[PDB]
Design a protein around this nucleic acid. Structure first.
Lengths: 94, 79, 137, 119, 47, 155
RNA sequence: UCUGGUGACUAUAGCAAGGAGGUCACACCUGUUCCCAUGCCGAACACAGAAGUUAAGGUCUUUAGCGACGAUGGUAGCCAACUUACGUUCCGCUAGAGUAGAACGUUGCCAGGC
RNA sequence: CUGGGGCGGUCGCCUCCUAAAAGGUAACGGAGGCGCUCAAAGGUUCCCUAGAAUGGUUGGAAAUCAUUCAUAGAGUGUAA
RNA sequence: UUAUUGGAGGUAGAGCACUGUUUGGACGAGGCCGAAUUCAGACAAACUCCGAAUGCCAAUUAAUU
């Protein structure tokens, strides 16, 4: 129940995302109770390996920058071709 | 010996708006040509026999909303 | 032998073949299914030909689902006559399939048995397919 | 179990339909009349701006008097007539709200007609 | 459906032509039109 | 009586609507007027054009777009009609049932299965005409209506 | 000040529930002599009453169960380029619809008695 | 006129799709109409507002209905 | 020709709220089984609760021409 994210910079061009999705990163967003709209990015293998313990629904400890919040999987855009995630949604469980 | 029976068609009636929004027009100028009440008449705007919107006072055109899902065109005397 | 009971117009305009599948890209009835990876026109003759070859090797030991139905009929002028004389008569019914669209769906059978049955029905289809299973992550 | 229908509801609807091609405008203001099951109220309103400049009711202290339940209307009409006579007593559009023109309203309508109200 | 010519009594001019159904109204049509020369709503009669 | 919180929540009898069924005047030139007078012989009112010949709502044989007669009786005439319905209308019936749904003509589904004008005995009638009388009440419930159907008059 | 009367704003203003009234005023109810009415019934409309009643409409409370309003973040398409040709590819531009989170039980104008 | 000519079929006007969110736009491209009717289907004033399922014509499972939904689902002299 | 702002309109997409088409569940309707309302999921040149990019009309001051 742990994950380290990285605050993404503002205004990302298509090429940027493509290059970011070409490696082992997947753009995500965080929003909910006692928090504002913050855009971050996590690892694909690190997310799938930490989503088999709690399963579909389960409280996780995301390291948004220099803080830890309890969030869950609200939505996730999946690509049928080449079975790869493209976007993840985190909602504050608090 | 194949035959046909679909080579008939009527003429096209130039419909649509005739005056732009914020343009100066003179009384009697046509503002819209439609088949029904696509746009209702506003202030200083009458409806013709063929549902044609025309101005009665010389001023600027103004396309606004009337209700929540109906449009309307009006004209103001202010130059 | 799959065709609509009745249609408003007997002459269409040939469905466009571009972009990716609009919907139906996940198996929701069976456990395994055949996913397309190329774009092409699927006629009713081929659809029923692949279904007969799948049930024949399954020996009525499971349920089969068809997520495609010929909705657009296409015409064809016979005995190659001179061009310009109007549209021809209906020849058959087709169905456009884009990459990421599930074709068939099997259930209530061995996982290795469904992998062989789907492979036999893929030889009667004019599109590259791929064996997939119910996803859940 | 047949249910009853509101009388003010239907009336309001009808009134709105009659207010689609009739409105006051300074020179020609509209004389709205509200008839209840006890008294009747009337006031000259200017739709152009949206402000009243007259008031007359049957529940007024200088109108309240055990009448024949129809004479009050006549007085009401004559009451606002003099009030309207002070300032703006020329061409005016009479509004019958949503009720019929025959009845107490008629008496109130003709009350100003004989008072001098050019309408 | 045939043509109808409303004749005048003073005018003497056919400045009013209308239509009607003989099978429907076989009787003569009598309406009150307006003859400019007389300048008065007179009672016209179909010939 | 049954825990009414006020003296205005007690149910009432809304209206009483009844008249002849088809009385098809397409082949019955004077039977229309005869049935009209028969309806006028129970309560004196002119007969209009509507389907007021049912025991409740509509749930019988279909056709639609007909041309029958109807009568509206809701005041002290309705009370007198109920009195005559307990006198002449229980001379031949003598069978109190119980229901609160539909019958002849959410209704609109039938116009058949009615009575045969029993109080109109062949003492001044030329035929028998279905004149089922629909019951209109301020009943908020069909079983409360059944409680009123046995209340103050034949079950 | 209060409830009313008449307006302006896109239902954030709707429907549903669960409540409390109130009798200033509304309503409800009582009639059919009176003007006036049903394609007939005084149901409605109209006039006269107005004894009783808040039961219903109803005004004020509570609830987001509906309905409507919907941040962001992504991408579908597309404009202009470049490449090989285009069931494209890549680089810039504008960035949807679906959906998440959420907001919503309306704000205003004028006249009177109060 | 014409994917050579002949044979056949068409030749004027009205509505939609093709038509690429202004208007306009072709083919022997795909669908339908008109060659009128109406003395009230006109003018003005006033007032009104389908389908489901239960007292059963052994039942066409829609008589001319009671009042729920109507929420306009209709209706408009005529094709869209 | 740009910049700035205002407006008219239903295409590409997407969607099933209407019209038609469709698949599995589900429909009863007769002394024995057959005309169905919901649940989920699809399709549309002559379907639309929605809806871009471009182009088009205009207005204003600026800036080049």
């Amino acid at each position: 129940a742990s994950l380290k994210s990285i605050i993404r910079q503002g205004k990302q061009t298509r090429s940027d995302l493509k290059q970011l999705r070409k490696s082992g990163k997947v753009p995500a967003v965080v929003y909910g109770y006692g928090t504002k709209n913050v855009s971050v990015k996590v690892d694909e293998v690190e997310f799938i390996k930490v989503i088999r313990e709690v399963g579909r629904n389960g409280v996780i400890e995301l390291g948004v920058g220099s803080k830890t919040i309890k969030v869950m999987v609200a939505d996730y855009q999946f690509d049928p071709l080449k079975n790869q995630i493209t976007h993840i949604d985190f909602l504050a469980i608090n | 010996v194949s035959s046909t029976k679909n080579g008939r068609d009527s003429e096209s009636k130039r419909l649509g708006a005739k005056r732009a929004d914020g343009q100066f027009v003179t009384g009697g100028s046509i503002l819209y040509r439609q088949r029904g009440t696509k746009i209702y008449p506003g202030e200083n705007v009458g409806r013709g026999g063929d549902d044609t919107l025309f101005a009665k006072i010389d001023g600027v055109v103004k396309f606004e909303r009337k209700g929540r899902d109906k449009k309307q065109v009006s004209v103001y005397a202010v130059a | 032998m799959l065709l609509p009971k009745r249609v408003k117009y007997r002459r269409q305009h040939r469905p466009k073949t571009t972009g990716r599948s609009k919907g139906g890209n996940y198996v929701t009835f069976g456990e395994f299914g055949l996913q397309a990876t190329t774009t092409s026109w699927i006629t009713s003759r081929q659809i029923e030909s692949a279904r007969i070859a799948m049930t024949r090797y399954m020996k009525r030991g499971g349920k089969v689902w068809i997520k495609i139905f010929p909705h657009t009929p296409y015409t064809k002028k016979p005995l190659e006559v001179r061009m310009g004389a109007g549209k021809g008569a209906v020849e058959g019914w087709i169905a456009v399939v884009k990459p990421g669209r599930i074709l068939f769906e099997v259930a209530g059978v061995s996982e290795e048995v469904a992998r062989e049955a789907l492979r036999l029905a893929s030889h009667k289809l004019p599109v590259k397919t791929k064996f997939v299973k119910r996803e859940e992550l | 179990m047949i249910s009853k229908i509101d009388k003010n509801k239907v009336r309001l609807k009808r009134h709105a339909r009659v207010r689609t091609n009739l409105s006051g405008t300074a020179e020609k203001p509209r004389l709205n009349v509200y008839r209840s099951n006890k008294h009747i109220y009337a006031q000259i309103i200017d739709d152009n701006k949206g402000v009243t400049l007259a008031q007359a009711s049957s529940k007024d202290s200088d109108i309240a008097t055990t009448a024949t339940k129809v004479e009050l209307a006549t007085k009401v009409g004559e009451a606002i007539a003099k009030k309207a006579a002070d300032k703006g007593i020329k061409e005016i559009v009479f509004d019958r709200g949503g009720y019929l023109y025959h009845g107490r309203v008629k008496a109130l309508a003709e009350a100003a007609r004989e008072s001098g109200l050019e309408f | 459906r045939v043509n109808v010519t409303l004749a005048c009594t003073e005018c003497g001019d056919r400045n009013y032509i209308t239509t009607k159904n003989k099978r429907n109204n076989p009787e003569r049509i009598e309406m009150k039109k307006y003859c400019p020369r007389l300048n008065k709503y007179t009672l016209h009669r179909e010939t | 009586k049954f825990n009414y919180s006020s003296v205005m929540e007690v149910p009432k009898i809304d209206k009483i609507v009844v008249n002849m069924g088809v009385g098809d005047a397409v082949q019955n030139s004077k039977v229309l007027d005869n049935a009209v007078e028969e309806l006028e012989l129970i309560t004196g009112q002119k007969p209009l054009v509507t389907k007021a010949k049912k025991s409740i709502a509509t749930f019988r044989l279909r056709e639609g777009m007909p041309i029958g007669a109807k009568v509206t009786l809701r005041g002290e005439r309705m009370y007198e009609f109920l009195d005559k319905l307990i006198s002449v209308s229980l001379p031949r019936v003598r069978d109190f049932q119980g229901v609160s749904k539909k019958a002849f003509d959410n209704y609109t589904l039938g116009v058949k299965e009615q009575l045969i004008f029993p109080e109109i005995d062949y003492d001044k009638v030329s035929k028998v005409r279905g004149m089922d009388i629909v019951i209109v009440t301020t009943a908020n419930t069909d079983e409360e209506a059944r409680e009123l159907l046995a209340n103050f008059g034949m079950p």
